[PDB]
Amino acid sequence: PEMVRGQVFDVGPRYTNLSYIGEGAYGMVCSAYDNVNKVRVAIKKISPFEHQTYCQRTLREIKILLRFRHENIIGINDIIRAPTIEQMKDVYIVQDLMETDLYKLLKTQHLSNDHICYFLYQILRGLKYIHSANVLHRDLKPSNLLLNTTCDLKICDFGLARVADPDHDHTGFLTEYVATRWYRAPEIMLNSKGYTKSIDIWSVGCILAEMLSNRPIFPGKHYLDQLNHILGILGSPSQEDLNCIINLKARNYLLSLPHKNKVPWNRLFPNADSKALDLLDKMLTFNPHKRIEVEQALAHPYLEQYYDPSDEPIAEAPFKMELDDLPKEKLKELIFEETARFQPG
Ligand SMILES: Cc1cccc([C@@H](CO)NC(=O)[C@@H](C)N2Cc3ccc(-c4nc(NC5CCOCC5)ncc4Cl)cc3C2=O)c1
C-alpha cells in the first residue's frame, strides 16, 4: 500500500499517486488520481471506531451526503473499507477535489464585492437545499466552505448535522455548545438546543461579516466571552426580544447588563455595499424568530444578479436519526451497512 506521512492509505487499485493535503482530529486527507474517472480526487482516511462521537460524525455525514445531490454541497463519490466488519478499522471517503477553502482564502486574499456576492449566493443556495430536506448543518464556518479555481463553492462536513425539531428547541442557560464558537448564535448560550434553521442563518451572517473585512465579527476568546462580543455589536436586546426568553436565569442575566447601543454596520464596514449590510443586519438578528430565512435571504436585493428560484433546487423529500443511545460498536455496523453499495458486489 502507498504510505503518506507515516499512514497506510489502502486505496488502490483504483486510486493512485497520493499527495498529502492535510490532517486533523478527523484523520488525514490526500489527493489521489482516480484511474476510472481520470481526475484527481480528495480521499480522507477516517479511523473513528474507538470513539462513539467520531462514529456519530462518520455515520451522519455518510447518510446525509449519499442522499443529497446539489452543486453547492460536496458529494461522496466513493467509499473504501474492508470487506468484513471484523477487518474494517478505517473508512476512506472519496470526494471531489477542491483547490482551497474560505478560511484559507480569508487569511490571504481581499474579496471584491462581486466575489462576496457570488460566495454568499452559493452558500445560501446550498443551504436552501439542506433546509428543504429538514436538515440543519449546525457547523457552517469558512473552513467548511470549499472552493475551486473558478470560485465555485461547496459546503462540506455534514457530521454535526441534525434533523430540525423546533418544538423541542428550548433549554436552559449556558448549557449548549452547538456550532463553532465564533459562528454560534446568541440563543445557544441563552435558551436553544440549536434544533431550528435559524442557527444556520446566524452562522451565514457571521461568514458574510467575515468576508467583508477578513476578520471574524464576534471573536470570542472562550465560550462565555462569545455573548459579550455579540451584544457588544448588536446592543442590548429589546423588551420584546427579552420577553421571548422565558427562562429566568437567561432573562435575569441579560437584565443585569448595562444598557449598550447598537454599533452601526456602516461604521464596522465602511467599504461594504449598503445592500450587503442590509442583508447582514437581517441574518444577525438577535431574536431567532425575527431572523431572516434562507428563501428570503436569496430574494434580498443584494443577490438580485443571481436570484433564480427555479435554479435553486430543493430536496426530493424531507430527510429521516437517533444515534446518541447507540454504542460505538452498533454505529460501526450501521457505517458498514451504509457503505455496502461501494463494494465490489
Ligand atoms: C472529527 C471527525 C471524526 C470523524 C469524521 C469527521 C468528519 C465528519 O464530521 N469530518 C470531516 O471529514 C471534516 C473535518 N473534513 C476534513 C476535510 C479535509 C479535506 C476536505 C476536502 N478538501 C479539499 N481540498 C482542500 C481544501 C483546503 O485546501 C487544500 C485542499 N477538497 C475536497 C475535500 Cl472533501 C474536506 C474535509 C472535511 O469535510 C470528523
UniProtKB/Swiss-Prot annotation:
Active-site residues, Swiss-Prot/TrEMBL: D139 (proton acceptor)
Domain of life: Eukaryota
UniProt activity-regulation remark: Phosphorylated by MAP2K1/MEK1 and MAP2K2/MEK2 on Thr-175 and Tyr-177 in response to external stimuli like insulin or NGF. Both phosphorylations are required for activity. This phosphorylation causes dramatic conformational changes, which enable full activation and interaction of MAPK1/ERK2 with its substrates. Phosphorylation on Ser-19 by SGK1 results in its activation by enhancing its interaction with MAP2K1/MEK1 and MAP2K2/MEK2. Dephosphorylated and inactivated by DUSP1, DUSP3, DUSP6 and DUSP9. Inactivated by pyrimidylpyrrole inhibitors.
UniProt entry tagged with the keyword Nucleus: yes
Cofactor requirements of the protein: Mg(2+)
Associated disorder: Noonan syndrome 13: A form of Noonan syndrome, a disease characterized by short stature, facial dysmorphic features such as hypertelorism, a downward eyeslant and low-set posteriorly rotated ears, and a high incidence of congenital heart defects and hypertrophic cardiomyopathy. Other features can include a short neck with webbing or redundancy of skin, deafness, motor delay, variable intellectual deficits, multiple skeletal defects, cryptorchidism, and bleeding diathesis.
Protein name (record): Mitogen-activated protein kinase 1
Source organism: Homo sapiens (Human)
Encoding gene, per UniProt annotation: MAPK1
